[PDB]
Structures are given as C-alpha cells and as structure tokens.
C-alpha cells in the first residue's frame, strides 16, 4: 500500500503546507500597495509578495522529512536555487484558468500578466509562466500531490553547488516513491495516466522558468532605483555570493 512511513510523510507535508499557506491572504494588506495606473509600478508590491512567499517556502522546506539532516550549506543551496520555482508552484493554488490570473481574495490582489510586466518582466518569461500555470492546473492535482511536488522540487540533487548529492537524491527518491504510490493508490483514470511523468516534466519546465526569471532579475536588479525597492531577503535569496 502507501506504507505507514509514506502516509506519515504525506501528513507532515500537508500540515507544513497548511501552516505556511494562508488561503485568506490576510497578510497582503501589510505589503506595499499595488500601483497600476515603465517606472515599474508593481515592483514594490510584488517584491513584498515574493519576500513573504520566500519566508513561507523556508518554513515549508524545514518540515520536509530529511531536509533537517542535510548540512546548512546544502540547505541554503537547495532553498536559493528552488525558491522561485516553489513560489511558481505554490501560486498555482490561487491561479484561475479562465482569465489567466492569480486571485488572492481581493480585487486589488487579483494579479494578471500586465501586473507582472509592471515588476519589470517581459512576455519572454510571463507567457511561458502562464502556460505553466495552465498546464499545471489541468493536472487537477490533489493537495497531497501538490505538496509532494513542491518537496521534490526543493530536494533536487542536481542543483548547482550541492555537496552531499547522494543524500539529497536519497531523500528525493523517498518522496518520489511516495508520490508514485499515491498516484497508483488514489488518483483515478484518466487523469492518472502518465501523471507522474507529466509532473516530472513540470519540474523540467520550472528549471526553464527559473533560468529566464534569473536572467531578467539580474538585469532589473542591476538598476539601483529598482534594487532599492527590493527587500533584503529577496536580495539575499535571488542574489548573493
């Protein structure tokens, strides 16, 4: 079946997500305001959004079974390289397929393609990003598959600079095996057909989005007027040496 250990992994991951994902979006009132009326008018608001999301990704990662047993160095490597990908994953939960937007509970916090461009990004990122969100939504993942996918994304042994790639892979494979068993046990046809392979392809697509995001970010953040609008945490996690 799903073993007791596998069912325990899922319960831990679900609780971690529930503890780090507020589906009421209460905290958003404290972000710098959306400005839509370029100069990059959404940059302050989306910087605070992302900075908040990084704090939640860290809290989630901390609870992935095994993650605590990696060295500090490997933990930092994994979080820095995956943060943007997990934020893209976790955003899918507010994503609405119909109008290609992220609905975070408020007319002001319904984000669209123009909003993202007003943080300095171009359609070279934004269009593939929308296509990702759409394709991911159409997988109709259960919450268990969603949180397993985020955990797998974080614990990737191929990330630049990982030292104990053996231990990372062992932790990842434990999570992948949990996922595959969950799909075999619980996910109904036809949605279950090649589902694991589709999910793995989404992780590949995320590396592409990560690369394009990082290029665009490196460029925009090189302008001091933009950099000044970013939070110290964003600057550290998307930047540092």
């Amino acid at each position: 079946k799903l073993s007791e250990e596998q069912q325990h992994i899922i319960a831990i991951l679900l609780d971690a997500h529930h503890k780090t994902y507020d589906p009421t979006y209460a905290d958003f009132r404290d972000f710098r305001p959306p400005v839509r009326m370029s100069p990059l008018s959404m940059l302050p608001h989306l910087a605070d959004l992302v900075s908040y999301s990084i704090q939640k990704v860290i809290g989630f990662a901390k609870m992935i079974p095994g993650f605590r047993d990696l060295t500090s160095d490997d933990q930092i490597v994994l979080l820095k390289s995956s943060a943007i990908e997990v934020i893209m994953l976790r955003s899918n939960q507010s994503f609405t397929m119909d109008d290609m937007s992220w609905d975070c509970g408020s007319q002001d916090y319904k984000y669209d393609v123009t909003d993202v461009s007003k943080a300095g990004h171009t359609l070279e990122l934004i269009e593939p990003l929308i296509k990702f969100q759409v394709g991911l939504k159409k997988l109709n993942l259960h919450e268990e598959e969603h949180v397993l996918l985020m955990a797998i994304c974080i614990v990737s042994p191929d990330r630049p600079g990982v030292q104990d790639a053996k231990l990372v892979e062992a932790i990842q494979d434990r999570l992948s095996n949990t996922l595959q068993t969950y799909i075999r046990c619980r996910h109904p046809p036809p949605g279950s057909h090649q589902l694991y392979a589709k999910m793995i392809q989404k992780l590949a697509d995320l590396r592409s989005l990560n690369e394009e995001h990082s290029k665009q970010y490196r460029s925009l953040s090189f302008q001091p007027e933009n950099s000044m609008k970013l939070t110290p945490l964003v600057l550290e996690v998307f930047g540092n040496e």
Binding site: I58, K62, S72, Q75, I76, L79, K80, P232, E236, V237
Partner: peptide, 9 residues
C-alpha cells in the same frame, strides 16, 4: 545572512 540564520540548528 538571513537564510543561514533561519536554518541554524
């Protein structure tokens, strides 16, 4: 920095 300090333990 902040990541390292949050992960410390």
């Amino acid at each position: 920095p902040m990541l390292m300090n949050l992960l410390k333990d």
